[PDB]
Amino acid sequence: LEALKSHIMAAKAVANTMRTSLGPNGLNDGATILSMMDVDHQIAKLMVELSKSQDDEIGDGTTGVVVLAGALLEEAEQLLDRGIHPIRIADGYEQAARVAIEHLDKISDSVLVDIKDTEPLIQTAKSCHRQMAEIAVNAVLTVADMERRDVDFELIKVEGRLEDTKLIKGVIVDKDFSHPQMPKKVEDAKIAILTCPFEPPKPKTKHKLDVTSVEDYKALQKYEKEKFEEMIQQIKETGANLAICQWGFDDEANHLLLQNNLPAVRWVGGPEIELIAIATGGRIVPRFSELTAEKLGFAGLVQEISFGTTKDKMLVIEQAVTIFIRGGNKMIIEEAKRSLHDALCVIRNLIRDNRVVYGGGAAEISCALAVSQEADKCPTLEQYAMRAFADALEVIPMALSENSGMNPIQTMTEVRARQVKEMNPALGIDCLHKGTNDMKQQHVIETLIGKKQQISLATQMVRMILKIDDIRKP
Amino acid sequence: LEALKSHIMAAKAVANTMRTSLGPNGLDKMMVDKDGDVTVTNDGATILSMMDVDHQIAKLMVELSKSQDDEIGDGTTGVVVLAGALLEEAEQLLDRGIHPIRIADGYEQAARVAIEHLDKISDSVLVDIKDTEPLIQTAHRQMAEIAVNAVLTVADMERRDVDFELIKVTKLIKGVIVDKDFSHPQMPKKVEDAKIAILTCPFEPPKPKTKHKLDVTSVEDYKALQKYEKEKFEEMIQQIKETGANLAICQWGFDDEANHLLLQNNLPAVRWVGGPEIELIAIATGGRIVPRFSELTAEKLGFAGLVQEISDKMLVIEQAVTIFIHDALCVIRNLIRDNRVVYGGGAAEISCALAVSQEADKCPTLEQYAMRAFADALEVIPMALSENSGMNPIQTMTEVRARQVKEMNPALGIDCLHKGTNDMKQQHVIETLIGKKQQISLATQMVRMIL
Amino acid sequence: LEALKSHIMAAKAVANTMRTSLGPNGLDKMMVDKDGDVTVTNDGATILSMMDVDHQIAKLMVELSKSQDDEIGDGTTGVVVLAGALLEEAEQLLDRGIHPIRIADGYEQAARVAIEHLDKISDSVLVDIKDTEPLIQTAKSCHRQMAEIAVNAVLTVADMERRDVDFELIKVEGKVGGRLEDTKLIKGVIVDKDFSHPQMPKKVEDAKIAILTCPFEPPKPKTKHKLDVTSVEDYKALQKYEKEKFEEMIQQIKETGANLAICQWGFDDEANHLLLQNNLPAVRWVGGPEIELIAIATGGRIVPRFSELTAEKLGFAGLVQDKMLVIEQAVTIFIRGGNKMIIEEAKRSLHDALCVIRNLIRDNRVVYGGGAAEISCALAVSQEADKCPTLEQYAMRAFADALEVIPMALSENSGMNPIQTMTEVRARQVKEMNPALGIDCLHKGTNDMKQQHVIETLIGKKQQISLATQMVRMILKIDDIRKP
Amino acid sequence: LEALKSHIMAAKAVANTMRTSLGPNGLDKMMVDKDGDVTVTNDGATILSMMDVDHQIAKLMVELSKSQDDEIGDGTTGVVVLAGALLEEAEQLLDRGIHPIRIADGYEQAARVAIEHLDKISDSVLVDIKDTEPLIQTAKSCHRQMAEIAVNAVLTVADMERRDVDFELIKVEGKVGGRLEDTKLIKGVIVDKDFSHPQMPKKVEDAKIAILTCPFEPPKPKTKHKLDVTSVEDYKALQKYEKEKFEEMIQQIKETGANLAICQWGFDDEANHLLLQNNLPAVRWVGGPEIELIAIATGGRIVPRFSELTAEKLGFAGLVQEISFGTTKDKMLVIEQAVTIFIRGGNKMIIEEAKRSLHDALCVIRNLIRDNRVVYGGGAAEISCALAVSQEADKCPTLEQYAMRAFADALEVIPMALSENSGMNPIQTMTEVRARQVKEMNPALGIDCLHKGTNDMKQQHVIETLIGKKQQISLATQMVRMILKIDDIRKP
Ligand SMILES: Nc1ncnc2c1ncn2[C@@H]1O[C@H](COP(=O)(O)OP(=O)(O)O)[C@@H](O)[C@H]1O
Ligand SMILES: Nc1ncnc2c1ncn2[C@@H]1O[C@H](COP(=O)(O)OP(=O)(O)O)[C@@H](O)[C@H]1O
Ligand SMILES: Nc1ncnc2c1ncn2[C@@H]1O[C@H](COP(=O)(O)OP(=O)(O)O)[C@@H](O)[C@H]1O
Ligand SMILES: Nc1ncnc2c1ncn2[C@@H]1O[C@H](COP(=O)(O)OP(=O)(O)O)[C@@H](O)[C@H]1O
């Protein structure tokens, strides 16, 4: 049994590590903290990969996920001391999780779309953020489904006065394309995406190619050039226009492309190939034998663009959008991308589910209330498990008050008392010493599907850990 | 949790290290580096540009005090000292049970109080004519006469205020001067209307990428080989001469009769210049750099009006000035951005401490205490100065503060040079409003980040 | 704070070493004497008595628990196990950040709530005519006999005409060797110590007894005194002097009647012979308690000098006859059994019975045990806790949980699933409105503790909850243990 | 200077151990007795009485505190807490370069400011009629009897004649067993010590008491000699000799008409036999104290010589009674002329809480007789005094300025500690309470460390006796001054 308590102490150590980074006064962004911190325990490795890739790619609030999981396990230990089997604790945790998720529907205030309604909600995820809200709303709406379904994913990425921030109709990419004397504007680009090397086909037998004179040296250069010309014709045989290429060719070879009118980009990175292959839909060609008119990107416009000193190229009309934040100072960016990411994510969740619950611990407290209600009407030991789930739900408001210098148990208990007395499920922690506790008066929303993903994912992690023993590491 | 007092102890150790080098009576520091010479000097700008990094917070003290202040002001030592004082008081606040967030917020509010109070203390300096010069005498007046014009040549003087870091070191040159002669003197010693071709590429024949082992037999093929690579070199000369070409600046060299190959082709060049010289010329003449192996175009060439060799070589009619033979140019630039000044010697810190104290006396939430702490933190600048001049620190500082309240003179402050009547006004100890604002705001950013 | 958590750990260990011996299926625990015998027995009173302690907190617990509850009767184990539960909950409250003083205050609140609720659970028992015993067979084959012996012994030895108190001059003498049920109630006192010199008559009518604590020594002098015998005539004069003063002692005793004369110290084998030639018969080597029992039972005197003996102070006993003392001015119970362990166990159960009777005389209200009263008090405490704002709230709820350790322990001691049985009995108690519903740790089929008759005395349970709350309050308020 | 900062660390250690035991919610401190019982109680006087006396600075604080405050008042904890606060504040002034003498002089200045401000804060209380009793309940659930017992104890042994100062003539005897309500008021004296014999009359009425300090011993020569008895007849003659002189001393006592005779020192096993058969009730082996109580209570003079007394120097206790308490027994003197309080409670340690609590009540009443002015506690007087000290501090030039401000802050340790001892946020609660004192102009507003009701200390009736607080701040300033002026601690 002790292995379970060891796991509980490990995951509890992770959650306690990430408690102080919860809330606006955190000490952060738990997504980056988990994405960077290295973990020794396998249970700590399992705290990540479940909180990171499952929640950062759907919603946000990863810190709340790991903290809630740590509280759940910490209560589950005290439940283990009474002799309750871990399967019972996990089942009760699942039942209480159902209760809370259902209570989210009862707390939820619904917001509409298509006329503001989301942009003002985006002003909360941060003048400095009105134009960014506009760019996020129009960005998601540009690549949104909206033919009911209400599911559209991140085909949108951001590149590094902020009033000059643009929405790029297609895809922006670095790398001026090989030799400036090439046509700076390719119209209807039949892109050839190649991840293959540019070397003559070397025979696979004993070489020792003893070139004895300068004449045979120049002839060797002429052969090495001839094979490359053959490659140019092998590419232009199925749609020229452009040729995205990882690997380079250097000065002598570049000309041959220019002379043969085949615009091309030199040794792009890992991305910018996947980026352009997704934008233009053209399949990548990795081999020097497997390219045709079927594996070609279908760009409508490709052009090189300068900014005084450096220059990058854009490709628009592609078969699906990017955000270009030009603002200078370069200390602002990578942080405008965080609030803008929260914008795009909150918008995506609002398209998926247009219901919001009010944060600051309010929804946590009222969910703990509902779970406690469904616990007081139950026999079997799962009763204690449900009450423990409520107590674990009440760690988010406690953690907020803690990180804001307030007395956690006192302020949390008083706020819960106000939630029961005033029938207001939006009363929570102040966190900023800013007026009242009414979160709707403070504009703190958290998108029902996001909170539901928090509770559900934390429950999944906790149940998985509540099983697991023996860890057979070599 | 305990890591806060530890990090505060480390950054405070960095501050106490540089406490003795503050003021005109500051102590020098040996500071040798890797198996080389020794550079004895005070002025914490170069001290923090060196100083091995012990803690991660110890490095965090640099580049915030260094890159944020040296590029706007110069008072880096005051920045790190003030930061160490703010953290040292922040520890005492952490003893009372204050949360660090409230300490940082109170430090921000008090910083607003002081920065705004500087506007009230500020004296105005006039521009557009001669007598910005004598002010510079505070930071053989010729240097001043050189500095002012040196900025004014590359300054806007209208409302955009950008002239940053384009000047370097008894006369002023309207362009840029660089070393490294013309490489083979038979070249034109005065290139006129120079379409400078700045290439940072190697000069080698394009070797193939397959198995070689060139087995040249009998001197015949040896001479044929030398003639071959010289032929390709001539092809390169025609690659540059195809685009303006008037002059060619190269990071790599040739180092034989290849110079003649240029001379016979009439393409003057310069051999083996460094990076922080190629960039200097490239921005000076506005000529894009060519990195790839002689894949250039006519737009990536400099357009310098005149470049000539002198008994080194000079580049004029460029764009963008150099002084032919900083402590003044920074003050001048700050005066152009904002012509308001405050009086140093710790006076501005004492009056700002008074303003923060007053604005803290009527205050609710615990940030009150923090603000009070901030005031005391500022008063470390006078005391330290007194300490560096052998005077009783708290005695002298208390007297100067009491006089600043009694006489309503926000310029009374430490006369560490033991010269005169404690006034700083008729002592000409000036500190340029933007500089002091940058000090307070920067130290506040460091402290609030460590918290 | 860490020192307080260590104190909670030591106290919790003391409780864990005790909860296994709670209830009728309680385990035994050897507890060897000081390089001597053993005493295999549950009943946490003797356990805490014979237990030596290491930690000062444990020492404090062992002193405070026996300081009151054992002087009341049963429940000495419930004090330490309930204290351990309260401290174990108080730890989980400390981890939340609640100050210890708030936990203690909430524990006092819940203590008053539960103690007030016991008055509502309470029933009533009558004390004037018999059939108190049905409440006594619960305290302990021959339960009716022992119950009648205890009730008669207490009702004989009691004020009861107001004052409502009982002073235990009841002596329980257990003689190994008998037939399990030959236990008799003797209107008088019985002690061992045979008559000195066998030829003294084993029967004294109208025995006027002289109780002495003086040594049978020649009248010694004071000051320095060095005695030098210079001739055989002075040696014989010494022996004759001591015989003279001795017979002076005997005649001095017989001047006041003195049919018998118990003495605490011994004789000389020459002494008891001179006592045989006179009609004095005496007993020797009795002992302090055994001469106090005779002192108040016979209307004695206990004089430490023979020469100051007067007839007015003699203790009258109608018949002195081990040796029995009947007809005097005081009752004793003579337990008889078989294989060395019939008694001592009969002594223990009889002690429990006498305690129950005395407490019933003090307060004739009872609550039904088996953990039922603890569950009902827990329901009341949590109910009042839901109607409380400040942090004390939590503490009160914790107190409730702490109470529910008494069922869980009992269940645990009878092989049942503690959580499941305690929860089932708590739900059955909520729905049936039956506060006399508890753990059936004897496997009798029923759960109603009114049936099966499990009694616990109101003031006994009150003393349990109050004393345990006091101990937990002290342990929670202690730090900086000096140890000079 | 390093020695001085070491002294500050030791003193502030003594303070840090005791600020947790400040207020009604103070922690208990186990402190066992060397190899015996324990004494678990929150009380600065007792905690400093035990107190691991290690550092000479700590022993110095323990010396001064009990040397004055506990001998005149009671507030022994706030002296050491405030002293530790003042030294901890003085450390940062030492680091600023301020000389210790300037610091101590500043603490004296601000201490005078606060002591003078207490007079402004002071309120009043009446005497002789029922007004003192209720404000004894605050010296703490049946404490209504505590007030009555203490007030009747001070007013029975009345000063009444003015000049207004009086203590000793009150003993508190505690016998374990019972409940707190069993505490009864006062008639005369109650001491331990059974008589001297079982058959001694347990009730000696109209007892003319003989108070002796002599031994009941036939006087020895004292010259180094050896008593050699050569025959049994001379042995008997010795017994008759010393019995004879014993009886001479007995009849020497009862010739003055002594119905009772206390002895204290010498009393053999033959002596009480000869005193019983002579019908002279007597008690032996009584301490030095509990005899002058008999001398003043029964108006008798202490007879020194081996029975050279007259009826002029005898007692006159109306009824002497021996009382049993289960197994032990005490001796009480009623109808005398000096009183004593008999306390019951049981549970081995309740009769200690209630004992020193009653002591605190008696001290409060005595201080009210001295000066019937009080300030309202709960840290209110400390906060108001801190406000005054800061007011005078901002209007001061030389470095004493800083010291004065320090003193202010030091005072505010008393509220914070209280807040800390009640689970509240100390800095926030103290700050808010002080701001409320400024706005509402209510100097009787301090930490509600009992969590019951409002904030103003006029309700809850928390009084402090002006003389007590004045002597508190004065004594703490004495400690801090002495420690500041100390270095070099030699200690051979
Ligand atoms: N303005 C606000 N006021 C109160 N609580 C907030 C506010 N903004 C965010 N929070 C709370 O902070 C919690 C965690 O967010 P944060 O600490 O920023 O990182 P993450 O979103 O990764 O958890 C959320 O549960 C939310 O309730
Ligand atoms: N002549 C002077 N009289 C008084 N103070 C001076 C004088 N010159 C410089 N100072 C003070 O010295 C401080 C620090 O300057 P210094 O130690 O030379 O390097 P840095 O400017 O990098 O801190 C300034 O804040 C200024 O107030
Ligand atoms: N026959 C019984 N049926 C159910 N419970 C019982 C029975 N006898 C005793 N108990 C329970 O056992 C508990 C402990 O009693 P015991 O261990 O004998 O001594 P103590 O009362 O000192 O703990 C009591 O609280 C009582 O409720
Ligand atoms: N009922 C109360 N309410 C508020 N404060 C109190 C109360 N009783 C005592 N105090 C405070 O406790 C402080 C210290 O008293 P205490 O802890 O009993 O030890 P001492 O009397 O030795 O100082 C006093 O300054 C007083 O202000």
Side-chain angles (χ1 to χ4, degrees), chain A residues 21-26 28-31 56 60-65 124 338 342 359-361 364 396 400 429-432 439 442-444 446 451 454:
Chain A
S21 302
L22 187 141
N25 290 335
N28 45 89
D29 181 21
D56 295 350
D60 65 350
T62 315
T63 306
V65 176
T124 66
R338 181 186 190 266
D342 302 323
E364 320 285 346
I396 300 300
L400 291 167
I429 315 300
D430 215 11
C431 267
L432 296 168
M439 291 293 102
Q442 224 160 338
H443 304 81
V444 177
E446 287 199 39
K451 189 68 62 180
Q454 273 191 351

Side-chain angles (χ1 to χ4, degrees), chain D residues 21-24 43-44 74-78 138 360 377-379 382 414 418 447 449-450 457 460 462 464 469 472:
Chain D
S21 179
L22 184 85
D43 176 63
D74 77 323
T76 323
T77 311
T138 178
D360 293 0
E382 280 70 25
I414 302 301
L418 294 165
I447 308 306
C449 51
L450 225 59
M457 281 300 164
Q460 310 189 45
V462 177
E464 290 282 347
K469 286 286 192 186
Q472 267 191 33

Side-chain angles (χ1 to χ4, degrees), chain A residues 25 176 178-180 198 202 209-214 217-218 220-221 224 250-251 254 266 308-309 331 402-405 433, chain B residues 68 99 101-102 206-217 221 224-225 228 232 239 288 292-297 300:
Chain A
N25 290 335
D176 63 84
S178 183
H179 201 295
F198 294 103
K202 176 188 300 299
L209 179 60
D210 291 326
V211 169
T212 56
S213 177
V214 189
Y217 194 59
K218 302 194 302 175
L220 180 64
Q221 302 175 30
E224 196 162 300
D250 312 294
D251 205 303
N254 188 323
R266 273 161 100 140
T309 67
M331 295 168 177
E402 172 187 323
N403 296 339
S404 302
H433 308 122
Chain B
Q68 305 269 2
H99 192 272
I101 280 293
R102 290 169 169 173
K207 65 171 301 186
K209 44 186 175 183
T210 176
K211 181 75 172 182
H212 287 149
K213 198 223 177 188
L214 245 177
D215 281 332
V216 288
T217 65
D221 298 334
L225 182 63
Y228 162 80
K232 312 294 289 184
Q239 294 293 283
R288 173 76 67 80
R292 294 178 298 198
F293 166 64
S294 299
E295 280 135 283
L296 55 155
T297 179
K300 305 185 180 187

Side-chain angles (χ1 to χ4, degrees), chain B residues 45 59 69 132 150 153 171 196 201 203 205 223 229 246 268 303 311 341 350-351 380 386 442 447:
Chain B
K59 177 155 180 54
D69 207 68
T132 311
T153 310
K171 61 205 302 166
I196 303 177
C201 60
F203 295 98
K223 302 175 72 77
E229 46 191 36
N246 265 106
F303 310 112
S311 177
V341 300
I350 292 175
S351 285
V380 83
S386 306
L442 175 54
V447 170

Side-chain angles (χ1 to χ4, degrees), chain A residues 78 82 381 384 409 413 416, chain C residues 96 393-394 419 423 426:
Chain A
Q78 185 173 358
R82 286 198 172 194
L381 327 181
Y384 311 109
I409 267 66
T413 303
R416 185 177 65 240
Chain C
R96 270 204 178 189
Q393 166 191 171
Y394 302 107
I419 310 293
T423 303
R426 187 173 55 187

Side-chain angles (χ1 to χ4, degrees), chain B residues 15 209 226 236 251 342:
Chain B
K209 44 186 175 183
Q226 302 178 22
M236 302 178 186
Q251 192 171 334
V342 305

Side-chain angles (χ1 to χ4, degrees), chain A residues 407-410, chain C residues 1 4 90-107 391-392 394-395 473 476-479, chain D residues 19-22 24-28 416-426 449 451:
Chain A
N407 196 287
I409 267 66
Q410 183 199 292
Chain C
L1 177 70
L4 170 61
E91 190 173 8
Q92 308 304 324
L93 293 179
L94 291 170
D95 290 356
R96 270 204 178 189
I98 300 183
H99 194 263
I101 209 69
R102 305 299 299 278
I103 298 171
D105 296 355
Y107 280 1
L391 289 71
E392 275 85 17
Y394 302 107
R473 178 172 183 83
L476 282 173
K477 289 192 63 184
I478 278 194
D479 48 349
Chain D
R19 58 171 288 163
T20 69
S21 179
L22 184 85
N25 301 324
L27 305 186
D28 280 334
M416 294 195 61
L418 294 165
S419 313
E420 179 186 356
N421 298 331
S422 304
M424 315 176 194
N425 198 344
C449 51
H451 282 297

